[PDB]
């Protein structure tokens, strides 16, 4: 069994640069490529005492790529698995989708094909991209299309970086976000949103870092990814594989959008403080103060949730806690699904990265849930997209690059459709 | 099994509570780093009454610090046994009330008390069967009296079926720190007669006189007074933490000591207290403890018990003692001084015996006498209140903030009728 991960964009490979640090630390692999079979799902063992990940970083600017090439993990990351374009896509969907896409995507899928050929028990792909930028949106959409037409039946778990409502680093990110969704719907099988204001609130509130940067965000997102691959990696009492998020959480072919959460998010001294037990962190992973996406599940209705548990966990108390959360009323469920939970337990407790702010915890919970507050998110982004499009602003960049108003109107009405579906299902 | 949640308010309460957790941790044998290091297996049996194991035997106290200035917080964290507390339970404002009861009860309470109520809720349902609440504060201060009182009212609104102990120091004119002492004490008493179940009246004057005469100290700093009160409080809840021949739970003490719902003001004493020079020249027997207990110069209030009657009194003993010696001593002291006890209640002395003395000592005791001599103190304060209120001194820093003249008139009426009912039962 193996799963390969691809990273697209400036955000993609910075998350990857934190994620692959965590894997090397989790399986005890030195940054120079050798230890001093649980690793087989991520690193392939070449020759004698050497490991080379099942990953492809790709970007259109060479600056952050050769930063990785000259960082710590020079010997670790294989030279070919870092694709680097000669010039940026520059916050432009059509630029990243039609001109440069045609010249980079063929080499990418050529590489990924012999990654899949060297693999044997491939579970699927999982992707990391940002829809606000140009590379992650444009050729992220292109590569996901060509992955779907090549393999298709395999799962494609997508962790996507959406724009926050108020905190924004660009101007044309509505256009790039919208044109990304229109392919994010029918090419991603299971898509998990990852905003930024929510995690800024998290690192300010619980981890109490007053001045956080992206690397902190990357490190705990990497912690989430590890907590939901731990089942394939490590021996558990009740395992839950990649095929389960497909089944137990996606009741409809066009409703696959999940709220993610994590607990316990704790500092070094607050670990000495708090008595960490199962029930209170199962409670903590439900309040909006610990979600990775800025939205309110109070005004929404849950659809289905999945809970990975790592560490010293017996099925008794986790079953007792979900029983208390079902008899609670402040959060409510749709009447469609009375048994709206899935659990999954892995024995391995999460590791600690030197220099991170998360302490050594005995047990951790990763909750991936579906709701309708995401249907509120897309409308909140829809409104501010229409405001800009009403004046034909910034349009000439895309048209001059090769596109027209067609994909504008059609992606705008697509979000309108998805709005109708979410309000219809939420009833 | 039975549970006590500890709350600390104001500077006086915080420093008293700090010494209290030092004494308690020393008794249960945990070092200031938070691990268990006791030898006898009698210590583990009842640490759930006060502590919570977090992970790997790190025992933290079930306490909640509450104030408005970080100065008390830094003085608490600086000393030993300071890092044992809950870093999150330092619920804590930033402005500072400054001896203004309206600021502690109307201005800053309104935006800090939600948070402290949330954390005291967390610590309440974290345990199963509460026994009561235990708050240490003052009655002259602003952030101690006002905020603590509003906290008490909110708690009694939430959990009306649990006990409540408040260790509150009362101001004396001889030892008078601030100038608005009656303006704070009268209002807090007005709220404690309706909210708290029973309280332990303390004052610094009686402590100073004790360190003069019986201890013969030359430098009785605040740490020493706080050490005396902490030994008193440890003696109070000794019966829940250790088995004895005649156990006395907190409610058991309350129902024995409170014959009328409004007559719940206690004077407290502790024994033995002997200087290092004379500690070699004394005996350790129950008559030795008793002659020191019923001494008027050993009460920790500014109220001469020879100036009134006792309604009831309780004696909590610690150590392997003869029970026949205990009750015959209580019978003897009640028969000799038959005038100073009340007439319409027979056997005015409740007694109890625990089988564990304070660490290193052989036999100790704690005296809690609900006497009627406390009316002298309230009259002593209410007359100052009338004197200032006759001419409205200092009144506007209270009126201009939301308080009215009606509160002060109501406080006067309640204090006066309280002293009237004490004089009635005399």
């Amino acid at each position: 069994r193996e799963v390969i991960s691809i990273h697209i964009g400036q955000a993609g490979i910075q998350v990857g640069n934190a994620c692959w640090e965590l894997y090397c630390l989790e399986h005890g692999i030195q940054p120079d490529g050798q230890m001093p079979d649980a690793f087989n799902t991520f690193f392939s063992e070449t020759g004698a005492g050497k490991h080379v990940p099942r990953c492809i970083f790709l970007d259109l600017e060479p600056t952050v790529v050769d930063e990785v090439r000259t960082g710590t993990y020079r010997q670790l990351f294989h030279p070919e698995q870092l694709i680097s374009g000669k010039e940026d896509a520059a916050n432009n969907f059509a630029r990243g989708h039609y001109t440069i896409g045609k010249e980079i995507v063929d080499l990418a899928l050529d590489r990924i094909r012999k990654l899949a050929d060297n693999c044997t028990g491939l579970q699927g792909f999982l992707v990391f991209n940002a829809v606000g930028g140009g590379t992650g949106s444009g050729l992220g959409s292109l590569l996901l299309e060509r992955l779907s037409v090549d393999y298709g039946k395999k799962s494609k778990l997508g962790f996507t970086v959406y724009p926050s409502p108020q905190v924004s680093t660009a101007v044309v990110e509505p256009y790039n976000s919208v044109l990304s969704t229109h392919s994010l719907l029918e090419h991603t099988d299971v898509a998990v949103m990852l905003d930024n204001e929510a995690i800024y609130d998290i690192c300010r509130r619980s981890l109490d870092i007053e001045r956080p940067t992206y690397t902190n965000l990357n490190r705990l997102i990497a912690q989430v990814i590890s907590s939901l691959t731990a089942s394939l990696r490590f021996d558990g009492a009740l395992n839950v594989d990649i095929t389960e998020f497909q089944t137990n959480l996606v009741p409809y072919p066009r409703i696959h959008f999940m709220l993610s959460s994590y607990a316990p998010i704790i500092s070094a001294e607050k670990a000495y403080h708090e008595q960490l037990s199962v029930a209170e962190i199962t409670n903590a992973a439900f309040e909006p103060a610990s979600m990775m996406v800025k939205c309110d599940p109070r005004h929404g209705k849950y659809m289905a949730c999945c809970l990975m548990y790592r560490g010293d966990v017996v099925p008794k108390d986790v079953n007792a806690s979900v029983a208390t959360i079902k008899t609670k009323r402040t959060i409510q469920f749709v009447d469609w699904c009375p048994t709206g939970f899935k659990c999954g337990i892995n024995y391995q407790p999460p590791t600690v990265v030197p220099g991170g702010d998360l302490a050594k915890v005995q047990r951790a919970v990763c909750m991936i849930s579906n709701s309708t507050a995401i249907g509120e998110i897309f409308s909140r982004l829809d409104h501010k997209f229409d405001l800009m499009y009403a004046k034909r602003a910034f349009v000439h960049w895309y048209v001059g690059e090769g596109m027209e108003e067609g994909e504008f109107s059609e992606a705008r009405e697509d979000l309108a459709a998805l709005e109708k579906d979410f309000e219809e299902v939420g009833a | 099994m039975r549970e006590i949640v500890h709350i600390q308010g104001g500077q006086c309460g915080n420093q008293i509570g700090a010494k209290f957790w030092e004494v308690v941790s020393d008794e249960h044998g945990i070092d200031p780093t938070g691990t268990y290091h006791g030898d006898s297996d009698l210590q583990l049996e009842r640490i759930n009454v006060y502590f919570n194991e977090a992970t790997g035997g790190r025992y933290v106290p079930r306490a909640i610090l509450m104030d408005l200035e970080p100065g008390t917080m830094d003085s608490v964290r600086s000393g030993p046994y300071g890092q044992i507390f809950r870093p999150d339970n330092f619920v804590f404002g930033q402005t500072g009330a400054g001896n203004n009861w309206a600021k502690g009860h109307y201005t800053e309470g309104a935006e800090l008390i939600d948070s402290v109520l949330d954390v005291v809720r967390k610590e309440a349902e974290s345990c199963d069967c509460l026994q009561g609440f235990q708050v240490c504060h003052s009655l002259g201060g602003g952030t101690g009296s006002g905020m603590g009182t509003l906290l008490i009212s909110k708690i009694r609104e939430e959990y009306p079926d649990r006990m409540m102990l408040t260790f509150s120091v009362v101001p004396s004119p001889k030892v008078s720190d601030t100038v608005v002492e009656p303006y704070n004490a009268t209002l807090s008493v007005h709220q404690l007669v309706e909210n708290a179940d029973e309280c332990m009246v303390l004052d610094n004057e009686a402590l100073y006189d004790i360190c003069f005469r019986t201890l013969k100290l030359t430098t009785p700093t605040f740490g020493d007074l706080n050490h005396l009160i902490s030994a008193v409080m440890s003696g109070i809840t000794c019966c829940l933490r250790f088995p004895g021949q005649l156990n006395a739970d907190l409610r058991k003490l309350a129902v024995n000591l409170i014959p009328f719902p409004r007559l719940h003001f206690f004077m407290v004493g502790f024994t033995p207290l002997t200087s290092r020079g004379s500690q070699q020249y004394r005996a350790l027997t129950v008559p030795e403890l008793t002659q020191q207990m019923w001494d008027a110069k050993n009460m920790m209030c500014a109220a001469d018990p020879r100036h009134g009657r006792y309604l009831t009194a309780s004696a909590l003993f610690r150590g392997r003692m003869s029970t026949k010696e205990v009750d015959e001593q209580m019978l003897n002291v009640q028969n000799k001084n038959s005038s100073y006890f009340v007439e319409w209640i027979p056997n005015n002395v409740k007694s109890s015996v625990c089988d564990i003395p304070p660490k290193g000592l052989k036999m100790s005791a704690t005296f809690i006498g609900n006497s009627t001599a406390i009316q002298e103190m309230f009259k002593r304060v209410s007359e100052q209140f009338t004197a200032m209120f006759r001419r409205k001194a200092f009144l506007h820093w209270y009126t201009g903030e939301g308080m009215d003249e009606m509160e002060f008139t109501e406080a006067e009426s309640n204090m006066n009728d309280l002293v009237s009912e004490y004089q009635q039962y005399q």
């Binding site: 037990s277 209170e280 | 049996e45």
Partner: peptide, 29 residues
């Protein structure tokens, strides 16, 4: 604790402390 939800738990102590199930913790041709 929790923002808009209130958890119900009981604390767990070591072997020595007399708690809800100390007797059963002590029990362990």
């Amino acid at each position: 604790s929790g923002g808009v939800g209130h958890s119900g738990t009981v604390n767990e102590y070591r072997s020595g402390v007399l708690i809800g199930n100390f007797v059963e913790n002590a029990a362990k041709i």
